[PDB]
Write a protein that binds this ligand. Sequence first.
Ligand SMILES: Nc1nnc2ccccn12
Ligand SMILES: [Cl-]
Ligand SMILES: [Cl-]
Length: 163
Amino acid sequence: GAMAPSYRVKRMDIAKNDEECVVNAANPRGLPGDGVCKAVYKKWPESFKNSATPVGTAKTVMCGTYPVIHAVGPNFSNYTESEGDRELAAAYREVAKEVTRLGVNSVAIPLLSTGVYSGGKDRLTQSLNHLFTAMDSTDADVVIYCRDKEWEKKISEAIQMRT
Ligand SMILES: Nc1nnc2ccccn12
Ligand SMILES: [Cl-]
Ligand SMILES: [Cl-]
């Protein structure tokens, strides 16, 4: 575990993370995809061997000794708000199990279902709160990776609020 487990946020490419493992915002078929998934495919292509897994699950594949946790959030274009909310919560619970099983002291994580799976809605608060529900009982240092400056500010404020 980390000596004083923390949450941090950084605005940069998750493929350049400084953590002991990465969470991919994966599609269920293990395809290269776009966004986080495509940068992850370019950085760790070996990790996409038998990475396909259902919505609401996480499957870890090693790239050398570096663990890539493929976490499949729901595409809110396809799910009802209610069913999507349940699957998004479940994907993060499966991430917490994998991070714990791997015995890592740190993990790089994107906000699942906030990009091309958002069904065109702002899901910063919904996705971040499900991340906290899952990860709060783990002792890994969590570093959240985001793209836009307003998202970095809002994620940083939500972390600082609970400290
Ligand atoms: N994950 C994330 N970071 N910045 C943004 C901006 C829009 C939608 C999702 N985002
Ligand atoms: Cl960058
Ligand atoms: Cl997404």
